[PDB]
Design a binder for this molecule. Structure first.
Ligand code: K
Ligand code: K
Lengths: 412, 412
């Protein structure tokens, strides 16, 4: 009924590194990538730190002339995409390019570019807007430009499901491959909302931590002194591949993507329900899609955003799905270190989940000094935990109560 | 292998009407919905007309208090969604709500809201941004709020593939139902980019017609004196339903959704290739997905945007897919009347395609006074053409060279 889908390539920019292996070394070491933001003047803002991408040089991937039309969220998406296509060793030919596509998305897209063109329009009027504004700032153009730069002719689209984007992108790209619409898909997410509208919009909603004096401690999922999420930038991308197609060309396979689930809370615009019953259904859907019993799960990479309401819902949902086995699995939030990459969070965390399968180690939940009422599971507090990981889950639960769960598994 | 998917409900706001049947009466009569734009001062702009939604009253759907947080693209999406859920006669219960989802998207989303919050931020600083800015302006919240207002717990996501959004949303929602992930999906698209950044961004790219003296004549697909697309607002939404589920409750079925195809040009950021070879592959994929031979197609609702390069590519692609039969089918662009609803274009045109199957009539391509070189097919110039329509196709081809084709068919 379904062809099998594996991960043959990965790419990343995060607040911990300009590629995957540098970012992952950071994760394993408990390193925070959070810091006061240098690129702009945040003095008037109630929050002043974030996970920024540091030292990014777009001209590793594109000429200065190409790069200049494109919002940072696009540059970030192409870079992760390029890394991953490279990482995969895939050679794109006339014989396969119609079988290779792209699903790279974003939660908010080109907010920086829109900001800047907004300034021009207000001060100098319509004619000063760039002619590349639209193509260089709408969300589908990570997918757009990547297909052009790589001559990829397969399914070409983009999701935008806020903080769940990255997770849904990967899952539905795998469904493209399982359905026969593609053999290969580049999927993932990118974001750069660290601009005045991003930080101010999230500040206005009071959704962000305001621990300005100690930014590396701001993101503390399941800690009783948590005060909101930490906004972060970057991108993740995976090369998904039908199993036989990868065997045929001798691909290195990191892991198998076995399950994808989805759900809606149908509850509230920004807050999850106390019992996490939407997240519970999503994980259950993802497990059944993988043909798995809850007891076969060894590691969960949580959404774990460091909001009061969400961290606790996620515990409820895990306890209700997994029962007693909730105490045997390890769950951690690597947002404790990376911050919340929004639409890219799902993508980088899928990659963290795959790496956790490769190296048999559960990354840590840093800053988990005083676990709140109920937060009594193995949350890998403080430091990496080597252990058996056969099956690894990655959740994302975003505004609009939109939920997504991926299930990965060691390959053989 | 696949469950069968039918259309049981439809909703719409367009520049021709505040619902489906008013909009469709306009279409059949050759009525243009294009007019100089009243809602803002366009004097400094090189284009000054558009397809606006006229007389919209959001309080038919939501309280003033609800409505006020939400960008117009969201209001427009919920309204079409509500219409269509209503139109369908579906009763949402605890027994089915986990089987009912939403895929409603947009190409650019809340550009108006972002504009306004941009002004506040510039003049008055961060603290003046609304706390509802983010939830009320990001694209996934049509889906978000609809699932909350209707208690829908099934798959919840949103696409953003620019001018192809509406087409992809519907196609992938049908795939949700064919796969077993849902029995029912509300899918479609909404847009309101008629704000300074929209009109100015598209003006800066020189992509818009500038026929300000005669706006009802600006949109003239395949006419030799065409000078770019006409920007338009609104929304379409369809209730997709597994076939047995609809039979079981005695649903009225408009038509069957039998095919969905996708492709990438991999060519250019904004311009299609001269031969339309990407669009050709997309239609071919869509036909094969439907189990259909080209000769079985009676009517095509074209992308037909009134750009020089795109209108002509689409002819090339149709001639190459359909061969001699290209001269027996009828193709028309209802953008001649509606203008280009961008991310909603696909959604309203899917609805036009379904209505064309219901009433056995091909809508007209208005303004097609002098067909360009090569534009010698039956393009239903000027006035509606009653005829046999068993099978109807709807194309969309958007920036990034992203392509989508839907195939509908009379039900029995
Ligand atoms: K996660
Ligand atoms: K169309």
């Amino acid at each position: 009924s379904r062809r099998r889908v594996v991960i043959t390539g990965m790419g990343m920019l995060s607040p911990l590194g300009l590629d995957v292996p540098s970012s992952w070394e950071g994760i394993l070491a408990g390193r925070s990538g959070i810091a006061p933001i240098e690129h702009m003047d945040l003095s008037a803002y109630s929050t002043r730190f974030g996970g920024s991408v540091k030292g990014f040089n777009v001209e590793e991937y594109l000429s200065a002339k190409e790069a200049r039309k494109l919002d940072l969220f696009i540059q970030y998406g192409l870079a992760a995409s390029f890394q991953a296509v490279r990482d995969s060793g895939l050679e794109v030919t006339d014989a396969n390019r119609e079988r290779i596509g792209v699903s790279m998305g974003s939660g908010i897209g080109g907010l920086t570019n829109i900001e800047n063109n907004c300034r021009s329009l207000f001060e100098q009027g319509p004619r000063r807007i760039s002619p590349f504004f639209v193509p260089g700032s709408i969300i589908n153009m990570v997918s757009g430009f990547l297909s052009i730069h790589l001559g990829l002719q397969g399914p070409n689209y983009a999701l935008t499901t806020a903080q769940t984007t990255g997770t849904h992108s990967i899952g539905m790209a795998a469904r493209n491959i399982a359905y026969g619409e593609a053999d290969v898909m580049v999927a993932g997410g990118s974001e750069m909302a660290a601009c005045g509208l991003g930080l101010g919009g999230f500040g206005a909603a009071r959704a962000l931590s305001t621990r300005n004096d100690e930014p590396t401690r701001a993101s503390r999922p399941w800690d009783r002194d948590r005060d909101g999420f930490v906004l972060s930038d970057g991108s993740g991308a995976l090369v998904l591949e039908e199993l036989e197609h990868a065997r045929a060309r001798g691909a290195r396979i990191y892991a198998e993507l076995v399950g994808f689930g989805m759900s809606g809370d149908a509850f509230h615009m920004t807050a999850p329900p106390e019992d996490g019953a939407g997240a519970a259904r999503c994980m259950k859907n993802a497990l059944r899609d993988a043909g798995l019993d809850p007891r076969q799960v060894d590691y969960i990479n949580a959404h774990g955003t460091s909001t009061p309401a969400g961290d606790i819902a996620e515990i409820a949902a895990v306890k209700s799905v997994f029962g007693e086995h909730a105490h045997a699995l390890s769950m951690s939030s690597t947002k404790s270190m990376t911050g919340h990459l929004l639409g890219a969070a799902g993508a980088v965390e899928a990659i963290f989940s795959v790496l956790a399968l490769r190296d048999q180690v559960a990354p840590p939940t840093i800053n988990l000094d005083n676990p709140d009422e109920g937060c009594d599971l193995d949350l890998v507090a403080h430091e990496a935990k080597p252990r058996k990981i056969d099956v690894a889950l990655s959740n994302s639960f975003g505004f609009g109560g939109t939920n997504g769960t991926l299930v990965f598994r060691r390959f053989a």
